[PDB]
Design a protein around this ligand. Structure first.
Ligand SMILES: NC(=O)c1ccc[n+]([C@@H]2O[C@H](COP(=O)([O-])OP(=O)(O)OC[C@H]3O[C@@H](n4cnc5c(N)ncnc54)[C@H](O)[C@@H]3O)[C@@H](O)[C@H]2O)c1
Ligand SMILES: NC(=O)c1ccc[n+]([C@@H]2O[C@H](COP(=O)([O-])OP(=O)(O)OC[C@H]3O[C@@H](n4cnc5c(N)ncnc54)[C@H](O)[C@@H]3O)[C@@H](O)[C@H]2O)c1
Ligand SMILES: NC(=O)c1ccc[n+]([C@@H]2O[C@H](COP(=O)([O-])OP(=O)(O)OC[C@H]3O[C@@H](n4cnc5c(N)ncnc54)[C@H](O)[C@@H]3O)[C@@H](O)[C@H]2O)c1
Ligand SMILES: NC(=O)c1ccc[n+]([C@@H]2O[C@H](COP(=O)([O-])OP(=O)(O)OC[C@H]3O[C@@H](n4cnc5c(N)ncnc54)[C@H](O)[C@@H]3O)[C@@H](O)[C@H]2O)c1
Lengths: 249, 249, 249, 249
């Protein structure tokens, strides 16, 4: 059963090589992520949340991702170097998985987002004029540095920083929130991920998970896609949510 | 096919009788809400959001509610006096109904909120030491004027005022947000409604939908209930959500 | 020269009684604060920030206060118990002070607040309709759980939890912020302390420093009194502000 | 005595030429702002707050400015097309004058900001890593899209959007708020304007009243300048502050 190990640097990759060898698993090494990753049964990412997002950008069909975290913190990950040898043995032996939806922009045709599709100002410190509508209905219009269309997974990223609610990973929703809105009152809008979001702005940019961005004027459509992100049932995912969150930055 | 027509003041009630009579519907006027309301094919509420919440307490089994708003803004209502006669007709001829869940606190067994359960301090200008726990797990421990456990429907009520997000009516979930938290960082949590909430504080009261209130010491659980609120299908519920929210005062 | 040492618990009192001994200063023990504290060259409180606020309710003319934070955290205190020996000697030999304004009320005539005056609902879970003017101009009319007229000192207290800004101690100003405002957009106003505040509300109370409360209806005015809180000089008051504020819980 | 009318479009400029003609004031017209505007007894900006910022950028020593808002809402302006005639005459013969301070920054040294000095990310959709200090003190260290060092006049500007308090125009003070901070727990700080602000970023840019901006890599210093902004006295500046803020959009 084949497995890929992706890594930022040489950190701990030797012990993971020998961790998978003990468990009867073919292993191949990957400095950078490629579209070849979907020829393997699973993937063991080594670096952090950031590393996982760069992997998913080279994946439509997503083989299960285990996630060793090098740094200090990580919400998408499964283990650390201190204790990964144990948690990997469990991960592969059960082979239980979970799947979180990935949305897609209309102007960035095949690149999918797990966290969000942000819509920012092309020039920094300049303000764009954003009009939002979902399922046809005019939801809002507002001047802001940007606008975020995040899934619940990404409710803990940019969205969090704009004032967003912490939404547990299992409840499946969009969070719609502006960045530095220039208006007296405003409120985050949480809606079902079955709807069709639309943003309309001139002189703007669109960014999937802080990774692929394109320029666009006019309008874009963001909806749920057919290809989710597959991880490895992290039984404690929920209980760990309120604590990883308590200690961001 | 008979009907109950509940009212606070003598609003447009001469007219609502006369529209109900013309649609060949028997009418029983109700000076105030009653348990007796269970025995009607539907209830026309005539007043505002508050009129409907009161109605709901005195129901377990809930006939369809056509709420009419004589005030400025009502998120639960289908029409105003200008349009009520056309909508009431559409509503009763098709008879399509929809239902949003009601929640249940330990302290008051046979009572049900549609908006929220709020745990506040018995005495005012005073903080309680609230501890929250969703599904066995510890999620928070904060000091505050109170804590709010609210459905998406009540996202636009009390919790809205405490800094909470506006969640659309068709996304079943809980919204757990404190009133006046004494702490550097805090966040509103939005979790699934299929979960077991538990609130722990001393010298406090619990309040279901701003109606029934009861002193409590120690522990309560809040959970989803088996007898929900029933209104007639509102084709434009989602559409108006965003306009009405901006006129809240 | 003479001093009154005010305490709640009789823990660290024999250590402090002997520190003041070897400083040519006469001592008098005070199990609870009193109007008699005015007859001393200074005061040494022994407890939290509350031990201080409780002291100032019995002072009009205020001799300098040296605060010893017992357990706890506090931004009105001058020293912990395991360094106070030194800090007292430095504070009484230098004998250097600084003063912060206290405000007054209409409804409670002889009473003075260092932190804030909070207007709240009389019955909890009920919101009142507050209507605020400063120097005669209407500023606002909001439905809320309460309203806080704070000073820069008490901007780290009740107004901090209502969503206020951290204002430094040396900038004299009012902070005007509501508690659970049922309104789409709202904002705290920071204004000059030389202005005459005026809150209007029915079915309410007023509370100076969470210490004294009286029912009221109609209007009250808050003004800057001529009798300031007086403390020894804390040079590190400003540099400690930011690290204490982070640890608020 | 002669004056300079500065406009952006040809809105009500003929009618303004004629008002100054009836007041025996020789007028020169300005397609846009020049250093040249220094040699006049007063100035009549015609457009908005933004037009006034542009004028001020070309001015060290500032002659009285009389703003006519042709737009929707102007914190900095005196009159509308309806009542400019009345008010222009009133204030020219009274010749009273207010002085709100402007602020210099240590990277574009001879430029001046009434509103703020914003330190932004150089590329967009990337967050920088701002370290804040004031009078040599570590007040914060935070990952964010940017950081506003605002004055009270610019507290209804960019800082307002970032989550900041409304500050009366006559309470002199800095305001230290971030844009999109990635941290569970932040708060805007309001400190004295006599203090020395200092920001340490990397991969950043500094902006001043949204006009002049230059790349910077290291550490800058914001501090109260020698030459302020000068407007004719608005007797209704304070009064109109609150209704104008409520219609910021
Ligand atoms: N808060 C902000 O000012 C800001 C700015 C740009 C991007 N982002 C977020 O960062 C993510 C990656 O973008 P980038 O590579 O440009 O920046 P990045 O990866 O260099 O830094 C963003 C930080 O967010 C963390 N992170 C990523 N996904 C997260 C999640 N789902 N929940 C909690 N934390 C998470 C990472 O650990 C990292 O420390 C994007 O998905 C976006 O949501 C945030
Ligand atoms: N914002 C606050 O400070 C505050 C305080 C207490 C109660 N409430 C809300 O009021 C409800 C009823 O309590 P009460 O009888 O004590 O007061 P109430 O019925 O008189 O007043 C509540 C106010 O909010 C409106 N409202 C009611 N339900 C709403 C909803 N679901 N979404 C948006 N607005 C709604 C009402 O029309 C009224 O203006 C509670 O369930 C709670 O949600 C809000
Ligand atoms: N945040 C809230 O929900 C809330 C509620 C009531 C009172 N308070 C504050 O507590 C003060 C005293 O009232 P109480 O005795 O009823 O509550 P308290 O004194 O029993 O508890 C208030 C907490 O805040 C601390 N505190 C007091 N003044 C402070 C200040 N200026 N800056 C930072 N922390 C401070 C206290 O040491 C204590 O930990 C009031 O002046 C009010 O500001 C806050
Ligand atoms: N809210 C935001 O996302 C944002 C972004 C960039 C700049 N700004 C503000 O705009 C100012 C000028 O920037 P620009 O020329 O790039 O855009 P601009 O001047 O065209 O737009 C800023 C908006 O805010 C208004 N404004 C300016 N000063 C104000 C004040 N003191 N109070 C209330 N409103 C005010 C302007 O008239 C305009 O409507 C800056 O000084 C900054 O304060 C705000």
């Amino acid at each position: 059963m084949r497995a890929a190990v992706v890594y930022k640097t040489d950190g701990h990759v030797k012990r993971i090589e020998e961790a998978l060898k003990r468990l009867e698993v073919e292993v191949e090494l990957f400095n950078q992520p490629s579209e070849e990753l979907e020829n393997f049964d699973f993937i063991v990412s080594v670096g952090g949340d950031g590393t996982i997002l760069r992997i998913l950008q080279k994946l439509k069909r997503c083989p299960p991702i285990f996630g060793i975290n090098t740094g200090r913190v990580g919400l998408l990950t499964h283990a650390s170097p201190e204790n990964f040898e144990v948690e990997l043995k469990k991960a592969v032996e059960k082979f239980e998985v979970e799947r979180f939806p990935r949305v897609s922009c209309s102007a960035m045709p095949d690149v999918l987002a797990l966290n969000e599709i942000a819509v920012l100002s092309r020039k920094p410190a300049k303000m764009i004029d954003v009009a939002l509508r979902v399922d046809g209905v005019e939801v809002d219009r507002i001047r802001c540095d940007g606008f975020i269309v995040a899934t619940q997974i990404g409710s803990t990223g940019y969205a969090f920083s704009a004032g967003g609610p912490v939404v547990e990973p299992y409840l499946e929703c969009f969070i719609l929130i502006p960045i530095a809105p220039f208006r007296f009152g405003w409120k985050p809008y949480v809606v079902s991920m079955e709807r069709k979001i639309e943003v309309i702005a001139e002189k703007a940019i669109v960014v999937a998970d802080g990774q692929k961005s394109v320029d666009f004027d006019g309008e874009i459509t963001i909806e749920k896609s057919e290809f989710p992100a597959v991880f490895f049932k992290n039984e404690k995912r929920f209980r760990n949510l309120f604590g990883k969150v308590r200690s961001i930055g």
